C-alpha cells in the first residue's frame, strides 16, 4: 500500500528485461493501474510521487507537511530545472519489443509499505480432516486444519440454482452424514440395534 489508502496485492513479477524502461535505463520496481486514481480522488499520491522525484534528483527532503505553501506548480518548476518534463511523465519503451510506448507514463519514487497479509499465511485447503466430538462436523480454522462454512447464504445460492444433489452432498458427504435407527411405531431413535 502506498500511504494514501491504495491497498493492492501482487499479480505478477516481471524481470528487468520484460519491464518497461525509461530512456536512461530506469525500470520500475512497481506498476500500479491508472484506474486506481480517478474514482478514489487520491491526489496526495500523485503529488508525493512528483515531490518524491525532485527530492531524489536534488538530494533534498521533500516536505509534504499538511498546511503549507508547497504547490504542485512550484514542485514542477523544480523538476523542470532537473531536466525532466515537469509533470511526472517520461517517454518509456516496451520491454518485449524495444518499441516506444505510444503514451507517456507518470514515473516516480513514491513511499510504499509492505503489510502483514501474505498469502502463505492465508492459503488453506481441506479434503477431509479432524472433526469436533459434539457435532461430528469439521473443526474450525486453518491453524487446526478445518473446513469452511457452507453458510445459509451459500445454501440459498445452491437452492436458487436448483442444484439439489449438491446441496445435499455438501451437507452430508462433506460435513456430518450419519445413519440411525427409528421405531416404525413411536418414531424416535429409541431402537437398540444390536447390529451384526
Amino acid at each position: 500500500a502506498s500511504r494514501h489508502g491504495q491497498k493492492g496485492t501482487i499479480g505478477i513479477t516481471y524481470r528487468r528485461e520484460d519491464m518497461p524502461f525509461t530512456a536512461e535505463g530506469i525500470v520500475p520496481d512497481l506498476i500500479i493501474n491508472p484506474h486506481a486514481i480517478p474514482s478514489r480522488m487520491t491526489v496526495a499520491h500523485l503529488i508525493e510521487c512528483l515531490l518524491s522525484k525532485v527530492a531524489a534528483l536534488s538530494g533534498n527532503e521533500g516536505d509534504a507537511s499538511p498546511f503549507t505553501d508547497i504547490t504542485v506548480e512550484g514542485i514542477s518548476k523544480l523538476l523542470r530545472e532537473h531536466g525532466y518534463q515537469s509533470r511526472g511523465f517520461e517517454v518509456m519503451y516496451n520491454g518485449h519489443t524495444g518499441k516506444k510506448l505510444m503514451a507517456q507514463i507518470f514515473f516516480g519514487p513514491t513511499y510504499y509499505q509492505r503489510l502483514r497479509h501474505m498469502v502463505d499465511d492465508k492459503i488453506h485447503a481441506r479434503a477431509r480432516g479432524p472433526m469436533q466430538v459434539l457435532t461430528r462436523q469439521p473443526v474450525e480454522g486453518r491453524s487446526r486444519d478445518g473446513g469452511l462454512r457452507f453458510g445459509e447464504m451459500e445454501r440459498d445460492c445452491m437452492i436458487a440454482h436448483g442444484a439439489a444433489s449438491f446441496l445435499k452432498e455438501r451437507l452430508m458427504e462433506a460435513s456430518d452424514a450419519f445413519r440411525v435407527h427409528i421405531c416404525g411405531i413411536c418414531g424416535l431413535m429409541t431402537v437398540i440395534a444390536k447390529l451384526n
Binding site: 437452492i159 436448483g162 442444484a163 439439489a164 444433489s165 446441496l167 445435499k168 452430508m172 452424514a177
Partner: protein, 159 residues
C-alpha cells in the same frame, strides 16, 4: 408535474398539470373533497391505500413503492421478482410483513419457521399443538439431510 397524454390528433404530447403534495396523510377524507380527481389520488402510505381502496389496489401500490426505491437509486430489477414479493405479502389478505410477525406465523411446517428468528418457542408450541410437518419445505430437507424438491429434486427418475 409534467404529463404525457394523447393529443387531439394521436401523438402523445407534453401537457403539464398542477399537482399538490402533503406533509401527512388523511386519504379517507381528502378524496371525498370537491374540486379534485378522486380517481387518480396517491399516498406513499400504502398502508392507507390498503385500508381505503382495499387489498388489490394495496398490492398494486405496495409494489409501486418498492419499485420506487430500486428506481430512485438508479438501478432496475425485473418486474417478476418485485411482483412475487409484493404478491407474497399480499395473499394472506392484508399486508403480512417480512418479520416473525408477518410470514413466520403461517402454519408452514414447524422446522421451517424455526430456522428463522424465534427458534425454540416455535418448536415448543409445535410440540404442544402436536403439529404435523409436510416436509416440502426446502429448509426441512436441509436439516434432514435429504434431497430437496428443488429443480433437480422436483421430480423422480425411473425405468
Amino acid at each position: 408535474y409534467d404529463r404525457k397524454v394523447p393529443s387531439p390528433t394521436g401523438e402523445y404530447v407534453k401537457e403539464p398539470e398542477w399537482v399538490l403534495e402533503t406533509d401527512g396523510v388523511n386519504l379517507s377524507e381528502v378524496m371525498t373533497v370537491p374540486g379534485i380527481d378522486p380517481t387518480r389520488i396517491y399516498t406513499n402510505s400504502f398502508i392507507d391505500i390498503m385500508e381505503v381502496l382495499g387489498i388489490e389496489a394495496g398490492r398494486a401500490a405496495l409494489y409501486k413503492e418498492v419499485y420506487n426505491v430500486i428506481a430512485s437509486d438508479g438501478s432496475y430489477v425485473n418486474y417478476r421478482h418485485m411482483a412475487l414479493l409484493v404478491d407474497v405479502m399480499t395473499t394472506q389478505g392484508g399486508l403480512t410483513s417480512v418479520t416473525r410477525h408477518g410470514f413466520n406465523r403461517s402454519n408452514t411446517g414447524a422446522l421451517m419457521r424455526c430456522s428463522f428468528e424465534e427458534t425454540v418457542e416455535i418448536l415448543f408450541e409445535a410440540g404442544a399443538s402436536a403439529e404435523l410437518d409436510d416436509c416440502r419445505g426446502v429448509s426441512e430437507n436441509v436439516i434432514l439431510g435429504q434431497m430437496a424438491p428443488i429443480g433437480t429434486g422436483a421430480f423422480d427418475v425411473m425405468i
